[PDB]
Symmetry: D4
Subunit: 164 residues, 8 copies
């Protein structure tokens, strides 16, 4: 069932990752977007195995109405940065926890982007993935007060739960 007939169901966030195994990490961002009723798309897009496709994905993101891209990658983690080099939409990079170096390689490859090409970097692993969802929502919430108000209530409920 398509949703071309609902502007409000059209993707605002693109959630991408270099491999299907990254989905174990990237699902957390998507759970947040589900919780906040923010429409999104999720795809495998590999910087190294599908480079042309990555460029196509990045180039067309804004015309397709995406406001934010969330990109996860591990090791020599180039996906977030190369997507960022190809769009001026904000790009959030989630370092996936790699086998040998526990995401230290992931983190440095993503966060140390040169002047001109920011990537919004979050924590290694599942906390970062959750936080990518939330940051995408915060970005949407800088224009849409309803989303902002919902983030406030969500945080307020957690505070109460933890404190009590």
């Amino acid at each position: 069932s398509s949703h071309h007939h609902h502007h409000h169901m059209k993707s605002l966030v693109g959630v991408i990752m270099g491999s299907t195994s990254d989905w174990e990490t990237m699902k957390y961002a998507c759970d947040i977007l589900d919780e906040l009723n923010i429409p999104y798309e999720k795809k495998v897009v590999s910087a190294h195995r599908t480079p042309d496709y990555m460029f196509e994905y990045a180039e067309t993101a804004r015309e397709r109405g995406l406001k934010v891209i969330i990109a996860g990658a591990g090791g020599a983690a180039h996906l977030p940065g190369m997507v960022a080099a190809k769009t001026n939409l904000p790009v959030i990079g989630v370092p996936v926890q790699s086998k040998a170096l526990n995401g230290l390689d992931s983190l440095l490859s993503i966060v140390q982007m040169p002047g001109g090409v920011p990537v919004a970097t979050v924590a290694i692993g599942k906390a970062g993935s959750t936080n990518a969802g939330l940051l995408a929502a915060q970005i949407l919430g800088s224009f849409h007060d309803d989303i902002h108000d919902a983030l406030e209530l969500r945080r307020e409920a957690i505070e109460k739960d933890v404190r009590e």
Copy 2:
């Protein structure tokens, strides 16, 4: 009104945070810049963060080094996007700064950029991209700036 707040724990961090501000001026984005210390002015930090939204800010850029708590603690107190710039520390060259900022727990994102001056520049650009995702004039300016760099480098 100011749309971006640029803050830092000490005046010594201004040497890093200048770059962010130069970017905002370049893109004609109104901003405010202040010293706001997580450790030396904690109450003031909470007041700044709490009141950001009411005051009209849309994004906060925060720089700090060492045990770099300013970005995360501001981020705990507002649902503005918070961009954390790791300042290069003396002994550990910003590794402490980076891990203190990027490793935030689920619930409280900080958008972390590169250690040092490159990060600072990119904080300004990132703030602009957040605004520019909805505001075409800012997006168009970002695309032009990037286009001119591409041409310079290629040619």
Copy 3:
């Protein structure tokens, strides 16, 4: 009443932080133990830190992992000695925890101890040594305890 406050950012930290408490009980030092989160209950953390002295506390032991801000931010809000226990984090094995706690700037000390359960045990003993600096009964009991371990390891 309680002379030591033992706090931590999440209930999952309790596995680590129980060790400090086991020490306080052993030594018959009255204490309280609470979940106080820098990032999820920031206002509550400030209130806890602010009031600690008025409430009779002499030392705070605070455990946290990752971007471990709890000990430092508590220490920014009280002049009680604050002892920080770096909880061993999943990806970075407490390297992030350690640097986020120990690298505090001039003005706001945190007494930092080892990553993990060893650190937590030592947090209890250090709170006791601080109390024992003005309470002979606690100092003597620390000396007796160390003497007993010495003889058992040797013999």
Copy 4:
């Protein structure tokens, strides 16, 4: 007589350890400062540590770099609180110093502060806070000190 002992492995560490002493001076807390080397004067280190309490010390601040054993070994030899300052080493920039001090085993705490001069300042302050857990006068002065810094920073001149 002295309430805090400030010790260090080498004369070169004094550049770092001065900062602790300045804080103690500012707060009018009596102290002594000495070179005590874990590796070059091991016996002298054991004597300093075991006799600190009878000499009237309440806290020891010990600085060292590299394989920085001074704080931990002093801590093994007294139940005074021992504060360890990792001195910034040449090759590894105090990473070796830090791990050597902070990673003490169950039974022998060392209260560890930041690498280098910020750490040294904070060791002074921490020693004060420990004394302040009994001396209300010292606690109060620490509070006024911090409040004065807060005002200076909050009301500082605008960035240009």
Copy 5:
């Protein structure tokens, strides 16, 4: 025609990358050198990599620092061997550069050499060794050069 392409993400990398070029000059291996930026000229980078083989290049030497994506992104776009030189970055002393280059996933190798100027020297030598696997003349020249250095080092005082 050039046999080797030497590329780098910024003119700031030239101080490092010259060392590779000096080796190619020494061995009379023809090459081209250009600034090609993964982050500032991404389309141009893909075009460079795409056309390399048709242009007659046999190997690419690519230098970058920090979030060092140039070597790997070029490697994704050509099956010529790609040698990655980690340029020493300011804060992290090339640790970021190295991990960003060497840790490539299965399918897309990058031949990684040492951080900084030794790496750069060695990138030239490795390019030459790759050519020397077919060209006996280059191989023999490599042997002679190494032999002369051996004599110089052993017989020095």
Copy 6:
């Protein structure tokens, strides 16, 4: 005759080094595989390296962990390209392996790939790319293999 030599310091490295060999088999590239230890069979190592060219090898793939000297010492003894695979070591997870291999001094390159099994796969592919620089058929098979993967991933 074999065009590639695949070597490793110990039989326990075979679990890693098989990935390279699988690639060469896939591409029908003739190769030999041997345990050759820098530290336990140093003379045998020099003989292997010395004679590689005469025996018809064009590239050597060498795997080693820890104080991983095998790739570099082989590289010191032949001007064949030498590809170094850092085997993941127990305590330091191949960090020692990596630095031991990659940081070769000027004069003696080693073509270094990723720690572990990804690296091993890539050493096979890199050996093939080196051959493919002078064997068009191998280059074209590499392109075909990558093209199939691209479609599988994309679709």
Copy 7:
């Protein structure tokens, strides 16, 4: 009587330190093994180290993890060669152990070997090499052992 002393901070360190002792057994080198703790038995440590030479020991092998002070503090108290084995620690996988052992200051060498069990084996071999530099029977036994391994690796090791 014992030529090598093998010491460690806890009985659980035997899991690592056994390997050094296996090598000494294999080479018929007489030794003693003891739990000696830098932090839990500091005075006992100093006494062990002080009297080593008079007791007839020629080399000490010391294992320790974390803030690993045992090797260096023993080395501060004797001019016997001291070999330090970094025990693999839980959080930091012996990086803390390694740095706190190897980075000893000028005047007080510790001969440091690899993290963990391979280091332990190598401490036994290195003690043997120190003895064997003057004692032909031990040198000969080391050469024989190394030679047998060379043959095994070269002529075994057939891959599948």
Copy 8:
């Protein structure tokens, strides 16, 4: 100027390094040997630039009367380990402080030797070099009481000077 006629002048320690630039670090070892009147030789021997020469040097060390080899190296520091692979004399490895990684690569390349091939590893840089010299002295002093006694007095003098 030869000393074949003096058994006591013949080298007991060999101090080797891969490049003349390493001499700035390795001289400290040699200063200690001078101080203790222990005869020694110093040579540039490179694992990577003179591999055959390194094997020769290691092979012949024992029969030349050497008791101990001190080897300094930086970066991918293979010299100590490869010498240790070729002799059963004790080998002391000095990690030289490298430019980019400040001797971390040096240290790991030297210390992490596999079972069977020990290298006695000392501190990064000049402190290690000094200690290489003292450790070689300690090894000789395990047989020669005069050297051991000299080590004790040297340490005693330093102790007094520091304590006072």
